Symmetry: C2
Subunit: 255 residues, 2 copies
């Protein structure tokens, strides 16, 4: 009869994880991506396009490997009797993934393309990558798809967490924290990409994907014993560090 | 370059799949569960309770192992380029799971409890198993939890499909075919449970779980996830196995309703 840790023990896990995120240099003030997105004067199409391709692959992998992690947990709950407080947290994960896979929240369903075109990595590909690709060469496009080492390392960690029953809680706990600052950074960068001196993105609804996200924006509820709690913090530490290294790679390329 | 098979080959897979469901004797007129549910004059609390406990465990495993199977497919899609037609079929699996996990379809959310109390195996436990359990002895309650062999075999197949990237497609293809007849069967069975001379289910709203399932299946493809001919053969083999085990588990229900 599986149950979550007592509340006060879960509050401690929340504080420890909020500290690891601090420690990983992911806050609006500490990560170079959020800073460069604000500081830099203009962005070349090739630089903006490369970051857009990297993000497409990162968010694709985030969605699918978080769903896989939820499935790993589902496999366990098929063979145990999770109590209703655990089941509620399990439902939350399913609901949150539904933003990226099916535009669940009204902030998304009103504006997103329907069907598969609305899946968030596809919607990003169609509305950010594609208009930038017209301003770059095929050789550039192929180069952008050879992902840099910090992005590759984060994707490798997502593949490992795809098999971990704690994996979806780890990924959503970290990503939900930094999501809004990422979205605001993108709103800024792609307003500053210029081609014939002129902005590539110059209408309102070319930012639909980004603005829907800024509008739109407990996981420890799935920890069932103190040991799994320790594993949760260990995994958050690894994953938060890899996310930070990947976002600094964004900042470096934008300069 | 990951794409569904051409529409001609998928239509052929669909026909082979319908034939496997026919051969498994899962149709309305074939399976002993639907027959017994229509024919029996009355159902004892102990017999109704046992079937409801077995059902609770079967539908709990169906939900979690189908979601696990979707996760196994997600593992593969994380590193491949599935085209938009595959992605659309993937979205559909996610949406359909949401009925049981989150009462996604409006027919369900209009009556279901909110939060985890609305998960379908939990809602069944609270509204069907619990009122029946008031009318059975402790010995009988413990016996009901000793699941019979055909039920255990089906749960084991569900565990095996939890790891299979085709597993969610296999389970939904079969269950969506038989869901209406199962729900109608339960409406008939639990309408005929009497304790003393009184109906155990004497108020319309006690049937809410069953009536919602009947409406959702009434008022309203998985082969689209098959990406080559070798996977198509595996899909048909898995459907044959899984449909056979579903039919045997339902035959076990029918036997319980007609026992000496
Ligand atoms: C990593 C996920 C981010 C924050 C966003 N939800 C997206 O669709 O890309
Ligand atoms: C096996 C699933 C059946 C058809 C129903 N959806 C339920 O919640 O039990
Ligand atoms: Fe998203
Ligand atoms: Fe259901």
């Amino acid at each position: 009869p599986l149950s979550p840790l007592p509340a006060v023990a879960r509050a401690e896990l929340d504080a420890r994880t909020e500290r690891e995120i601090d420690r990983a240099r992911l806050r609006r003030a500490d990560n170079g991506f959020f800073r460069s997105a604000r500081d830099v004067e203009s962005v070349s199409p090739a630089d903006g396009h490369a970051v857009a391709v990297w993000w497409r692959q990162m968010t694709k992998a985030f969605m699918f490997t978080t769903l896989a992690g939820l499935g790993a947990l589902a496999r366990d709950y098929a063979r145990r009797d999770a109590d209703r407080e655990l089941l509620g947290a399990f439902q939350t994960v399913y609901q949150v993934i539904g933003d990226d896979l099916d535009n669940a929240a009204p902030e998304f369903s009103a504006v997103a393309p329907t069907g598969p075109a609305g899946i968030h990595y596809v919607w990003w590909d169609d509305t950010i990558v594609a208009p930038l690709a017209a301003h770059v060469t095929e050789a550039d496009r192929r180069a952008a798809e050879e992902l840099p080492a910090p992005v590759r390392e984060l994707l490798a960690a997502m593949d490992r967490l795809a098999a971990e029953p704690l994996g979806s809680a780890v990924q959503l706990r970290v990503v939900e924290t930094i999501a809004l600052d990422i979205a605001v950074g993108f709103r800024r960068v792609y307003g500053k990409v210029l081609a014939g001196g002129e902005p590539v993105f110059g209408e309102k609804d070319q930012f639909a994907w980004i603005d829907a996200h800024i509008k739109a924006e407990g996981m420890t509820g799935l920890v069932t014993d103190a040991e799994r709690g320790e594993e949760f913090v260990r995994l958050v530490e690894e994953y938060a560090g890899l996310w930070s290294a990947a976002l600094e790679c964004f900042g470096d390329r934008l300069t």
